[model samples]
Target chain A: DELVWILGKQHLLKTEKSKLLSDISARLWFTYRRKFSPIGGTGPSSDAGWGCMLRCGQMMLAQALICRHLGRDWSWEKQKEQPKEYQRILQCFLDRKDCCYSIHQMAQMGVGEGKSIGEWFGPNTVAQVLKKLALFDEWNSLAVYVSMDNTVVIEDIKKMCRVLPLSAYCSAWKPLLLIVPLRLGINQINPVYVDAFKECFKMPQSLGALGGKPNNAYYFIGFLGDELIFLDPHTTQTFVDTEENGTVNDQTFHCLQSPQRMNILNLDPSVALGFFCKEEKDFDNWCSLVQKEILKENLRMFELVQKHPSHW
Target chain B: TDELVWILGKQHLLKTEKSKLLSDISARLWFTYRRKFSPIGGTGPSSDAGWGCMLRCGQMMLAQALICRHLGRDWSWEKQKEQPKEYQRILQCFLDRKDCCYSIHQMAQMGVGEGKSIGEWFGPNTVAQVLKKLALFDEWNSLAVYVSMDNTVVIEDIKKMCRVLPLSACSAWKPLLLIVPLRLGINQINPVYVDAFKECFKMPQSLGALGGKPNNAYYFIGFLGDELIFLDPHTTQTFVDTEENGTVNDQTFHCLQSPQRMNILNLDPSVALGFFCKEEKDFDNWCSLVQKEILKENLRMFELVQKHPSHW
Candidate 1:
């Protein structure tokens, strides 16, 4: 059996192979694969420190536009068109114009110059970026600072997810990704957190908060029991060579393990950020799912049926 | 078991330190168990009945077990000076144990100042901290001043305490906590695990432990044949009254009473933390044997019980 369970049906990519990349690469790569196309080509990188957080902002906007591309009537035809459409929007951000946050902006924020974004952005930045893109012209988005402490309680998250539109229209709406800034290493996602996420049936992604041990970003997309699935942005490599000359081998891209589950626990500050739909209906659906989970847990705690009745 | 035999044979400190440490430890340990009567003309939180009784009970159990192991079955706390040097040495031995075993004055330092009252709740963290501190003192010869403060404790915490306790127990010296669960009747002990305890530690000699609802502390001392001896810390009275009302009265002490027998089912689901042990050669032998049982039964269960199977 595949011992590791990960969330999201997406391909994996790394941000840096020959250069330094940030956790933003992992977050952006996750967004791209989950809603758009595979973020092919070299991932975001800097000369020194990791640049994943800034790229996360850029990627969030790109994915928002991608949500609009899929539109009200998504189908096989639109699915076929995803790669080309995804690449087109991706390049727009790569060019650093038309509402896309640039690497230069990231540098100004002290990323990759022996400094990194340290608690600089919250839901405000996420909403501001999406708003600047005029996402409301097609689809809407909302961001709120839910928690300031390094950790967010599972109950609080459930409460936040309590309301969402349950109809087909709302179902088509894009999900708001919770962008958590954690001081933990990519290999240190707590099992308790994973269990909580699994119970909620909500796939919470991971982001490497700048300025931590090893200093990088990661997209924790799924969990398989005790194992965690991470989209590591610090490892950017692709199969583009032959064994005859040993130009490139599978080992070169060892970091880009996709759909692979591994064990990890919290090793740093835990600041989790999240995303959901802008529509109240979609939000309600999210809440409903969490509420159902709560009910299930309650039933489990106080079940009436006797699994093993006494002989007497 | 083999190491225990060896240690017992090789022990030079013999019974001197054992009785000394046990008495001292018990004195320091007894501060919290019984109800805290009001201080005359004192400006502090007035003592109340049923407050911190369970935590107090836990404190007593640890002290009793450690003392028993170090001093053997012949140990008692008679003719000892209050706050004696040996007692202080015992107190100094455990740094974090003082964290949970705080005086009303210390509680004042923790923001429970003035008329705010105290002991309404004692989380697993406090107990774990105390246990962890003990282990550290034994193993590292130091306490963790930099340890992070937390209030929640789980089975995992108990497991860790159990694992470390034996590992940290000075083979040259000696030690030993409670809980409750379901309510089948007025006072009915669950035999499923109680029998195991009985089989593990001989009755009359084996101490009974207690945990309380919400958060409190209490205890059961011994088995008067079929019935269990109880020491409810919540009930307080003058020393004279305790001696006169020896036939099971509410004057700080009570004798064996039928319906009031040892019933763990009435306590918290965790069945309250419990503990057990015996000195020098005997103490080393006890720990070595217990460690052997720990390997047999797994660290988690052994710790959960807080008693080794071979102790009986």
Candidate 2:
């Protein structure tokens, strides 16, 4: 029987197909919505053509928040009163203007990236937006570090996570959501980094990677054999509003149908890899796995450094 | 304004230092939309008025790098003072003619590799990659143009790319034009990065940044209080070909008028910070200065690593 990797978790293909699909459904999916309140009172009420990558960015962060509060094993079920933490997470990503990671905020924030209200965004652009939006999320206190130039400096990340003054419950260490945007090759994903790319899902810190040929970006959750499993944000669903019970109809939020699959070779070279380290131990263990698994590859996709260079 | 204004690291009181600062900015080449030039790609738009602002901004930024490379950083431009031979030669490269080394024709065509159509819009990373490729054809400059991908600047990779041996002289370093494209915030520049953005100009080898707002791009040179002083390339001008009379009517190339300024809060987040290191010593000094100033209190917009990162 073949083994399946759903992010950091592993399962048997035929034997555990139900559990695998459940794990996939557990991810908080953010997608395009129409008929929401206008972004800045007069901006577009619909983000059909130009908000997929931003949606994908939200999905990545939502996954991090879920992992931070609820365990990764938590899955969404229909017609049930969800946990308070789950409701809190869902509320922040709603289509309303005041929501922290709402479509309104993402679209408005994108203006700073030189993108108009209804403009497409590249992988790096959304990664940068997510990094900025994460700053206002004091509830999460997650250190969102977007690695640049396909390189991640450990010292910088270490300093970023330790920016708070020590207090009674906080030990100066904050949770981290590290997003590394990379271009594997020009035009298409280079076959050389294919093995290392797969290694991303095997690590416990995996929040899944996101990218697409153009703006049809997907939120990848894991891999099965040679195919990648992802949640496509192309579906244009009507905006779901919160009800009197404090939960909206989230049936469209999860990929209930057969999981979406794509040839890994067809993945775009322009991509961003996301990892959520809930604690210092999780991040240290992730670094360990990366060295033992990814660094050994002959063609290194990105670099991991310990300190700033001596020569500058 | 009586506030002290800075342009490429030199500080001056805006009222008293108006003349010196204006001369410094005007000395930097101004590339803008041109009319009546050769049709791009033999059949494309004859003028890039509407969709070529980012491309023009790229030209202006790269022009400043070349200005620093051959003419030295302190060089200034005068109204009737005859420009140097190097100045004329550098100007020829960006001339709107297709035959020129770094012409709009070449950039638009070269942008195909970056998935941009002729006369289409572009971002800073797109401009940086196109410029990196175009710099190779100019042998007289002999530059090692390094464009940092994924927002990281790896010192090891740069050293390996720039270090070469000639005449058995030990490790002679080639001049480098380092372009670090970054997303400083989402939808707009984050308030926290305001100090870090100014630090780029404080560097001795600062080459300014390439970004403005949506649809319009600016080559940001430096700042004064809350306003960022820049050179605007939105104006459309008549194209003039070089006469065979050994002198060029380069009046259109220089911005003899006062420079443009805007609020720093209005800057677009998607920008590429550039620096030209004419010697290895200059590059070293840049690193130390960045670590000292920009890296303070973790306000750095980008990271500089001594070596590549590892999984371990």
Residue B134's lDDT within candidate 1 is 35
True contacts kept of 2: 0.00
Q: Could you tell me the lDDT of residue B29 within candidate 2?
A: 87
Runs of candidate 2 exceeding 4 Å displacement: A78-81, A167-170, A310-312, B1-312
Report residue A253 deviation for candidate 1 (angstroms): 18
Over the stretch B232-256, how does candidate 1's per-residue lDDT look in tens digits? 5554433221224322122122222
Question: Which candidate number would show the highest lDDT if scored against the true structure?
Answer: 2
lDDT (Cα, tens digit) per residue for candidate 2, span A93-196 = 99997888999888756654435567787888888678657656779877777786677777767755643232322435678988889999887889999889
Stretches > 4 Å off in candidate 1: A1-22, A25-312, B1-48, B69-73, B79-84, B91-187, B190-207, B211-217, B235-273, B277-312
Q: After superposition, how far is residue A282 of candidate 1 from its true place, in Å?
A: 19
Q: Write the per-residue lDDT of candidate 1 for residues A2-52, one digit (tens) a residue.
A: 222222222223333211112212223421111111111122223223444
Identify the CAPRI category of the predicted complex in candidate 2.
incorrect
- Report the lDDT tens digits of candidate 2 across residue range B213-283: 65698888889888888888888998878889755576798887777789877777788898989888989
Q: What is the TM-score of each candidate against the true structure?
A: 0.35, 0.53
